[PDB]
Curated annotation (Swiss-Prot):
In the N-terminus, the macro domain displays a mono-ADP-ribosylhydrolase activity. The central part called, the alphavirus unique domain (AUD) has a zinc-binding function. The C-terminus region, also called hypervariable domain (HVD), is mainly disordered and binds several host proteins. This intrinsically disordered domain contains 2 SH3 domain-binding sites and 2 FGDF motifs necessary and sufficient for the formation of nsP3/G3BP complexes. Interacts with mRNA-capping enzyme nsP1. Interacts (via C-terminus) with host G3BP1; this interaction inhibits the formation of host stress granules on viral mRNAs and the nsp3-G3BP1 complexes bind viral RNAs and probably orchestrate the assembly of viral replication complexes. Interacts (via C-terminus) with host G3BP2; this interaction inhibits the formation of host stress granules on viral mRNAs and the nsp3-G3BP2 complexes bind viral RNAs and probably orchestrate the assembly of viral replication complexes. Interacts (via C-terminus) with host NAP1L1. This is Non-structural protein 3. It is a peripheral membrane protein. It is found in: Host cytoplasmic vesicle membrane.
Length: 163
């Protein structure tokens, strides 16, 4: 584990992360997709062999020895708010189990269900709160990746408030 487990946020492409493993914001079918998923496909295409997995789950596939944890958040266009909330919390719990199993000291993670699966709603606080609920009991250094300047400030504020 990390000597003093922390949370940090960076505004940049997660395909350029400096962590021991990455979480992909995957679709259930293991397709190249869009947004984070397409960037992950371009950087680690080998990790998409048999990566299909249901909503609310995570499946890790190695690219060389680098682990890519495919985490499938719900598409809020299809789920109700209550069911989508439950599946989003479940996807993050599965990410925590995989990060623990892998023995890594750091992980790069995006906010699941905040892009094209958001159903057109701002889900920063909802998604980040489920990320903290799952990851708080792990000892890996967590680095959250985002692309928007206002989101970077809000995520940074949420991390700092708890310290
Ligand atoms: Cl970048
Ligand atoms: Cl998304
Ligand atoms: Cl963002």
């Amino acid at each position: 584990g990390a000597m003093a487990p922390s949370y940090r946020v960076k505004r940049m492409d997660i395909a350029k992360n400096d962590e021991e493993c990455v979480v992909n914001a995957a679709n259930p079918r293991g397709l190249p997709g869009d947004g984070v998923c397409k960037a992950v496909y371009k950087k680690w295409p080998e990790s998409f062999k048999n990566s299909a997995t249901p909503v609310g789950t995570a499946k890790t596939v190695m690219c060389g020895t680098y682990p890519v944890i495919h985490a499938v958040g719900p598409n809020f266009s299809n789920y109700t708010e209550s069911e989508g909330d439950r599946e989003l919390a479940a996807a993050y719990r599965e990410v925590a189990k995989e990060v623990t199993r892998l023995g890594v000291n750091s992980v790069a993670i995006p906010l699941l269900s905040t892009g094209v699966y958001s159903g057109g709603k701002d889900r920063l606080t909802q998604s980040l709160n489920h990320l903290f609920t799952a990851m708080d009991s792990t000892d890996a250094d967590v680095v959250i990746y985002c692309r928007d300047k206002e989101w970077e400030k809000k995520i940074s504020e949420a991390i700092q408030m708890r310290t």
